[PDB]
Amino acid sequence: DVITAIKAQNAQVAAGQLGGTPPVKGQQLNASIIAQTRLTSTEEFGKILL
Amino acid sequence: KNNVESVFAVNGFGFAGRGQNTGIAFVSLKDWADRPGEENKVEAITMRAT
């Protein structure tokens, strides 16, 4: 149970841009999404739903 | 149409980044005997364009 938390709590997953891959007719904005990141502190780790 | 043979233009592909911002176009030039000089020489075709 500790193991399977550090996993989902500390992973890091993709998600597209905006336009980029085939956009819709006439588009004014394309920029990258930033979903989950990885933890970076002792305290930041300490705070995990178990 | 005096110097240019053809223009291959590629969108999603430059040499720097690979995004939409960046693209390039390779231009082919007319036969060898069908050009005088200076106005048909790459150096100026370029000057003009740039």
UniProtKB/Swiss-Prot annotation, chain A:
It is found in: Cell inner membrane. Induction: Positively regulated by MarA, Rob and SoxS transcriptional regulators (at protein level). Disruption phenotype: Loss of susceptibility to contact-dependent growth inhibition (CDI); inhibiting cells still contact the target. Homotrimer, with large domains that extend into the periplasm, interacts with AcrA and TolC. AcrA may be required to stably link this protein and TolC. Interacts with AcrZ. Part of the AcrA-AcrB-AcrZ-TolC efflux pump. Belongs to the resistance-nodulation-cell division (RND) (TC 2.A.6) family. AcrA-AcrB-AcrZ-TolC is a drug efflux protein complex with broad substrate specificity that uses the proton motive force to export substrates. This is Multidrug efflux pump subunit AcrB. It comes from Escherichia coli (strain K12). The lineage of its organism: Bacteria, Pseudomonadati, Pseudomonadota, Gammaproteobacteria, Enterobacterales. The chain holds residues 202 to 251 of 1049 of the full protein.
